[PDB]
Amino acid sequence: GQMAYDRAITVFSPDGRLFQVEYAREAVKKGSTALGMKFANGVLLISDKKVRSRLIEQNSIEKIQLIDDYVAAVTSGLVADARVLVDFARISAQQEKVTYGSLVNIENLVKRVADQMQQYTQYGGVRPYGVSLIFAGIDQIGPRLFDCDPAGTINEYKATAIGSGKDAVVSFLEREYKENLPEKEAVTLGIKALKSSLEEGEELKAPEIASITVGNKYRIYDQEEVKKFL
Amino acid sequence: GQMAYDRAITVFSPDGRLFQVEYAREAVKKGSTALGMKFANGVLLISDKKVRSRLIEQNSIEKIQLIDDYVAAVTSGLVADARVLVDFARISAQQEKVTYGSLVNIENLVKRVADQMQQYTQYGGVRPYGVSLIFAGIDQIGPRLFDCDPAGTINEYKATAIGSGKDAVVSFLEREYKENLPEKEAVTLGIKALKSSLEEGEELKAPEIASITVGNKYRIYDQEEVKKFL
Amino acid sequence: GQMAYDRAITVFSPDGRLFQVEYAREAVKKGSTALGMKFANGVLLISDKKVRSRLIEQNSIEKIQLIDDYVAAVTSGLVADARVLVDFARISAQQEKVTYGSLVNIENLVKRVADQMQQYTQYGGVRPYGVSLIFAGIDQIGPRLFDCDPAGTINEYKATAIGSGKDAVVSFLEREYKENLPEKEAVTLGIKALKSSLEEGEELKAPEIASITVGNKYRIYDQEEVKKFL
Amino acid sequence: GQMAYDRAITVFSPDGRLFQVEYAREAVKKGSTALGMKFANGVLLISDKKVRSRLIEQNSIEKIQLIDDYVAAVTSGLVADARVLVDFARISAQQEKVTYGSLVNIENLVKRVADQMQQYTQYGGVRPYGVSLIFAGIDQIGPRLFDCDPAGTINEYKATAIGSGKDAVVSFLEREYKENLPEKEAVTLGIKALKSSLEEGEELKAPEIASITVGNKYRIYDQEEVKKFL
Amino acid sequence: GQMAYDRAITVFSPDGRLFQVEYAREAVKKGSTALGMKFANGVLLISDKKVRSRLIEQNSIEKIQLIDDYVAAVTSGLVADARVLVDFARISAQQEKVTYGSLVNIENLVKRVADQMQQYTQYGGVRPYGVSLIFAGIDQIGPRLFDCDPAGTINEYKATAIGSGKDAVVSFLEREYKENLPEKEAVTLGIKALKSSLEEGEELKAPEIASITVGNKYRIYDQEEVKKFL
Amino acid sequence: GQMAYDRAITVFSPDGRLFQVEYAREAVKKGSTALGMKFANGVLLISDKKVRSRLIEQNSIEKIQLIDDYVAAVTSGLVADARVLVDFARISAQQEKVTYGSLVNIENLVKRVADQMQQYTQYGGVRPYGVSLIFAGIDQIGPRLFDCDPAGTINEYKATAIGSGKDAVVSFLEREYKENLPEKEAVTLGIKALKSSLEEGEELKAPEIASITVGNKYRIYDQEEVKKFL
Amino acid sequence: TTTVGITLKDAVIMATERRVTMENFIMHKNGKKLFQIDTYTGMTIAGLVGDAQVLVRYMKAELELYRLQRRVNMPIEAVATLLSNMLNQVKYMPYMVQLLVGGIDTAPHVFSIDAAGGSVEDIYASTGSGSPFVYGVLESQYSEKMTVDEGVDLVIRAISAAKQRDSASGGMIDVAVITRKDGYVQLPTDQIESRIRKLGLI
Amino acid sequence: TTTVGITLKDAVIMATERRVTMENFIMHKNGKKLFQIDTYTGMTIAGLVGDAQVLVRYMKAELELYRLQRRVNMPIEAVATLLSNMLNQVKYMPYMVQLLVGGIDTAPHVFSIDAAGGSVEDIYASTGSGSPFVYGVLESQYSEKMTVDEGVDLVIRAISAAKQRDSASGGMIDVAVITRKDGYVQLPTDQIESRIRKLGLI
Ligand SMILES: C[C@@H](NC(=O)[C@H](Cc1ccc(O)cc1)NC(=O)OCc1ccccc1)C(=O)O
Ligand SMILES: C[C@@H](NC(=O)[C@H](Cc1ccc(O)cc1)NC(=O)OCc1ccccc1)C(=O)O
Ligand SMILES: C[C@@H](NC(=O)[C@H](Cc1ccc(O)cc1)NC(=O)OCc1ccccc1)C(=O)O
Ligand SMILES: C[C@@H](NC(=O)[C@H](Cc1ccc(O)cc1)NC(=O)OCc1ccccc1)C(=O)O
Ligand SMILES: C[C@@H](NC(=O)[C@H](Cc1ccc(O)cc1)NC(=O)OCc1ccccc1)C(=O)O
Ligand SMILES: C[C@@H](NC(=O)[C@H](Cc1ccc(O)cc1)NC(=O)OCc1ccccc1)C(=O)O
């Protein structure tokens, strides 16, 4: 039954489902866990790192990407598709700055990215992007936190997560998250949430941390500062 | 089950896999083994040679190709697709020089090549390139070493390998690689890594060696110098 | 198993094979045997002739075609596709002469032809050319000898062959070929190689012979001269 | 086995065959037999006529068509496709006259027609022409006689035939054809060849005869002259 | 066997047949019978009428259509496709008059219509017209009578028929047709031919009659004149 | 058998049928019954109304649409496709008025609509309109009444009907219709015809009535006048 | 340039001179300005040489294709109409030519066509810089009852007068006669010279 | 610029000078204006150097491809017709050149082609600013019965006269002789100098 309605993107199932979009969401769950949360006059992003062999440079596997000095993004899923979407977001942000002289709402930037992803779910001959993204930054309204799925759906969160351990992290944040926390406390809480999603075999491995506050630009935590919360 | 989701490039499997991309990676493993590693103020490339009949000229089977005087590439997989990608890289490098007057980051050149390969995995009516590439050179940041797969993924390495004996070489380099080695020592280590990947029947056959140092252009090792490490 | 991955050109097999390209190579092996070899300051081409009924004019079945006064080609496989590729090569050669005033490297001409053939193996809605070609001539580097397959692969040889008796001829040349032979000796050796590939029933039938030397243009052997080596 | 590789034009069989092209050749063998032969300073065409009911005008079923005053063609196979190809040949001939002021080689005209037919065997969404053609005329080289098949192959003959009785006619001409015969003798020989291809039930029925000599234009034999050889 | 080669227009059968074209000819045989014949300095058309309910106006079911004042056409098969082809013929006739100032040969007009129909039998994504047409008129050569089939074939007749009772009418005309008959006698003969094609149950029902003579325009027989031959 | 030739619009059945067009006609029979008839110097339209819940406004379910002040149309079948065709007819009518300054023949307007519908039955990638239409109005010839089917066929009637109860209404009109009736009598006859098509369970429910006379514009019957014939 | 075409009872006579003025001097003395474009049709050209030669090649191709498809020669008025459409379609980037078309389909015809595509049938016409001198001779001496021999002498005298007064005209006179019985016949040069000597024009 | 081409019984002789005037002064004294474009065909160029050089490359490519496809050399009149079409197709954005084409197919031919695509065959022709001086020499001294040696001396004298009166012409004279027996042969410079000394032109 299901195998008869899961071969083409533009085919609805008898119960009104799009299995090709659903299958793309399975690719997202294979990616590394990442999360973001808002705090007092700021927002931060944490991305888990799976340490590979020592032959890999520790500068290209960074999943946190700056869209500009005030907007950052983190992705999960197909790396190649994620790189294309990040490049599209950067071009879209600059187009906004050329047209109006500045960027006023981050939600508009997310919508342009999501509209691009939604287009690849309605026309034949293409496949949907197998990537989920989280956008966080500061605009003329304040700290913002958004997520985007392969289907192109947009939601705004006080705290959210993507990746393989998404369910474990969101459950942990459902119990222990507090609003308007200081930046240091928020990072400690985020480390515990990422810690509570791994298996018993492994342990936390000094992830990527980035944050921004109102009136300032994005700053990337160095390895020395990360070890302090480790 | 798998045979129902491995016929079209733009079809996701129920577990979120792209089998056509995976099958392209099988073509890569049929190619000859090649590797590259960085050393003190430089980077080198080694490509194994399978000696065919004496009727073949020993000038066209060279898998190491110069993108410019400061960037070189080596490929593995479908030869015909590899030639097209190398030509695309050379044109892309010259476009960068015309626009800005010079080449500043090699990673940008690799991204343009990878974006071309990623495009052939999302649109119907085309097949992905069955080629993996390694890019090494000197730019305004220093020695660089990149790899690219049929899916269009990009990673940066201190040392890496491609081809049939990729697993054996990377395991050997995982145990014996050292940083900031002199050029002569690095070549000797690379020969042993390539040696430790062949079967008991055959033996090493004077491969291709190329290297470059900061402030200089790429130089190709002649047969006389290769025999000295043989 | 194989029958599920051999219907479309743009489909990889589970073991990373392109069966449609492979099937095109089967059409090549149905053609008449042809070979070429380099000698002292020159290169020659020999193409076997299968004598049909006397009603056929002995001027159109010539498989050796001049690309210009200094480059010649011989083909094997589908005659109709071979004619199209030869016309494409002739146009490409003239485009080179208009742009630069002369032709410097024959290898560049072969690459343009091979790129055309490679394109017909990656896009849907078209089939690959079922033709293999051998290019021989004199350029600013010296005598050159190239071959091209339906997949678009390029190799340079001191001596090579195409067609049905390719395996027998290359084995014979693997044992008896010598470098820098005089033109008369090279033709005699080539006749024996073509002779050693036929079945016991038939015999050699005065084939086509063409050759060129440095500083001169291509000359076509007449029937009188061919009978002297017969 | 064969039924799995005979549905699409752009699909090679495992043994390197194009069955759709082969099937088009079957449509040709359903057409009426026609033949042409060269004689002393001239060339002629003979086309068998199958007499239908008396209600059909005896002016439109003529299979011999003049391309110009010096080139004529005869076709066999699908009538509708044959009409299109004849119109294409006439336009191509006039384009040659506009560009150069005259027509020098008839073989060039045949190649343009054959290239059109070859194109319809390599691209999807179209079917090959089910027509075989014979071109005969006088140019700056002398009497010419060509044939063309659905695959687009070109051959030059002293005498040839197409249609249902092609095998019988070519066998008869293989035994009794002579070169440089007078025009009257050549017509008598051609009538016997066409006669020797019919079944025992029927008999020859006053076919179409056309001929041309050097320095003159094409002339069409009238019914009175045809009865003289009947 | 047949069901494997009758789904696509651009697919040849193993015996060189185009079943989609053949199936279109079946739609033609469902139409009402119509016929035309030439007489002394003229030509006429007769089209059988199947009387439907009295609620239908007796002015739109007329199958005889004037292409201009000197050319008329009658169709059989799919009414909707027939209307499109008649409109195309009318536009084509006016294009001829604009270019040359008059219409010289009716056969040229028929060829343009047939070329349009032939095009819809060689390209995928379209279906052939299921219409057969008969063209009759006066040009600079004299009375003309042509027919056209879905395949685009053209034949010229002294008398012919189309529709369901085509076989019965042509057999009757094969026995009783005479040339250069007066107009009144020709109409009487045509009525008998149409009468001899119906079943025993029904009877002739005052059909459409149109005729034209040299030096005059087309005239449509009124019901009063039709009853005189009834 | 039938299931093998009913999947694509551009496929003929072995007996020369287009099942996709036939299936579109099934959608028409699901619509509400409507009819039109001509009377003395006028023509009227009646469309049955199926009373839904009271929450629906009684102004948008009107199936009678004015093309202009002198032409009206009523449709049956897919509502969404019907709206598109009505909009196309309105644009076509205005194009006629811009080009010539007025509308002379309504039949020309119907042909443009029918040509649009016929086009969607011959090209792949589209589906036919599942709508039947009736056009009635006054032009320079007099009262006109036309119908159009999904196949694009055009017929002119003194009285006709479309919808689910088409067969019952046309049978009733076949027995009781009279020509040149007064407007009041014609409406009473039309109500009885619509009444004689419903089932025993339900009853007539004050339908839509519109009419026009020579020299006047279209007028829509109000509910008060409809109840007088109820 | 001087071209002329006249009609008789059953014949059409066309004639031109041969002088070509390229780069403001007499560069060519034996140019060709009279062409056969069909079995019973001829054409003369005046104006830009490049434009005229292209049109001649186009007309030969169109008329030959027309004959092969419709099995009959194109009527003379249809030839003029085809030329009229071709020239008018590019009227704002036009061919800078003056054309005469003459031939036999069922009766003699001569057509004059301008650069804008205007086509007018006439009993006789003349084009080129020497045309007004020709019209003077034709107005005073042309007769519809003339024989073919008298018509040939008439066009020779008219062109000879033009050469005496128009510096852009000169060279040998080429004459063609078109009849149903004999088709398109170009008179030999020696015959033209004999007529010139007999008329006392040298 | 001064170019000339003449026809003899079985030969074609073409000759040019070498002066190139770039930026209103004599910048180059040894320019090339005579080219071999086929086995038995040559061409001379006058006008804009850039346009002329592009056309020479086009003609070499077209003629070589023609020879390879149809197995024979293109006829001389066909070469002129091809050039005529190419120039006329861009007449409103034209090549600002004057061209001479000469060669042997079955008989000697010389064609003159202008920027608008007009092509006229002639027994002899000359192009460039020095052409009127050449025509004066040819009108008084050319003979159709001349031998090849006499023809070579004739073109040398004609170009020498042009160099004495046209400031845009000068430099060494290049001469080519085309025959069926010997093909395209460019005369050596020393032989030209010997003829100049024998004729007393220095
Ligand atoms: C780095 C990134 N993940 C990754 O490393 C992803 C995980 C993944 C693998 C296979 C899939 O089919 C889907 C997703 N790997 C990935 O994108 O490369 C593997 C790949 C497999 C098939 C087609 C193309 C590429 C993350 O942690 O978000
Ligand atoms: C030189 C290069 N390898 C090679 O020589 C590759 C290896 C290969 C063969 C078949 C495959 O299907 C895939 C890869 N051969 C190759 O590209 O030519 C064989 C070929 C087979 C099928 C389609 C097109 C070409 C290397 O060593 O990297
Ligand atoms: C002259 C040339 N060979 C030939 O004569 C080739 C050999 C061949 C036949 C059938 C095939 O499917 C493939 C190759 N014949 C050929 O090209 O014509 C036969 C043909 C068959 C099917 C489709 C189109 C054409 C040679 O000797 O190289
Ligand atoms: C006049 C011409 N032959 C003919 O009359 C050909 C013979 C033929 C029939 C059916 C086929 O499938 C193929 C060929 N008939 C033909 O072209 O018309 C029949 C036809 C059948 C199917 C599709 C289109 C047309 C000849 O003698 O060459
Ligand atoms: C008036 C005209 N015939 C007719 O009335 C034709 C006969 C026909 C019916 C169904 C078919 O599949 C094919 C032909 N009817 C017709 O064209 O309308 C029925 C139709 C059926 C399926 C698709 C489109 C339209 C005639 O007598 O020639
Ligand atoms: C108002 C109009 N009829 C209607 O209300 C039509 C009747 C119909 C329903 C389903 C069908 O598949 C076809 C026709 N309904 C309708 O167009 O909406 C239902 C629908 C069903 C499937 C696809 C799109 C729309 C009428 O009375 O003419």
Residue numbers in the entry:
A (entry chain E), B (entry chain D), C (entry chain C), D (entry chain B), E (entry chain A), F (entry chain G): 4 to 233
G (entry chain H), H (entry chain I): 1 to 202
Wording from the paper:
The ubiquitin-proteasome system (UPS) is a crucial regulatory pathway responsible for eliminating damaged or unnecessary proteins within cells. Central to this system is the proteasome, a molecular machine that selectively degrades proteins. A hydrophobic-tyrosine-any residue (HbYX) motif on the C-termini of proteasome-activating complexes independently triggers gate-opening of the 20S core particle for protein degradation; however, the causal allosteric mechanism remains unclear. The architecture of the archaeal 20S proteasome is conserved resembling the eukaryotic 20S, but its α and β rings are homoheptameric rather than heteroheptameric.
To determine the details of how the HbYX motif induces gate-opening in the archaeal 20S proteasome, we used 20S from Thermoplasma acidophilum (T20S) and incubated it with ZYA. Additionally, we noted a lack of density in the central channel showing the N-termini pointing up in the ZYA-T20S map, compared to the WT T20S map, clearly indicating a conformation that corresponds to the open-gate state. This ZYA-T20S structure resolves the N-termini of the α subunits up to Gly4, which include three N-terminal residues that have not been previously resolved. In the ZYA-T20S map, densities corresponding to ZYA bound to the α intersubunit pockets were clearly visible (in blue) and resembled the expected structure of this dipeptide. The carboxybenzyl group (i.e., Hb group) docks in a hydrophobic pocket, interacting with V24, L21, and A154, 3.7 Å, 4.3 Å and 3.6 Å away, respectively. Additionally, we noted the backbone of the dipeptide hydrogen bonding with the backbone of G80, V82, and ZYA’s C-terminal carboxylic group forming a salt bridge with the sidechain of K66, consistent with previous observations on the importance of K66 for HbYX-dependent gate-opening. The ZYA-T20S model also showed that the binding of ZYA to the intersubunit pocket shortens the distance between G19 on one subunit and K66 on the neighboring subunit by ~1 Å (essentially the walls of the intersubunit pocket are pulled together in the range of 1-2 Å), primarily due to a shift of K66 α carbon. Thus, the intersubunit “bridging” role ZYA plays leads to a K66 shift that promotes a rigid body rotation of the α subunits. In this T20S model, the T13 side chain occupies the space between Helices 0 and 2 and I12 is seen binding to a hydrophobic pocket created by the neighboring subunits N-termini comprising A11, I12, and V14. Interestingly, the ZYA-T20S model shows that T13 is pulled out of the pocket from under Helices 0 and now I12 binds into this same pocket, which is mostly hydrophobic, containing A11, I12, and V14 of the same subunit. Simply put, I12 and T13 switch binding locations under Helix 0 to switch from the closed to the open state.
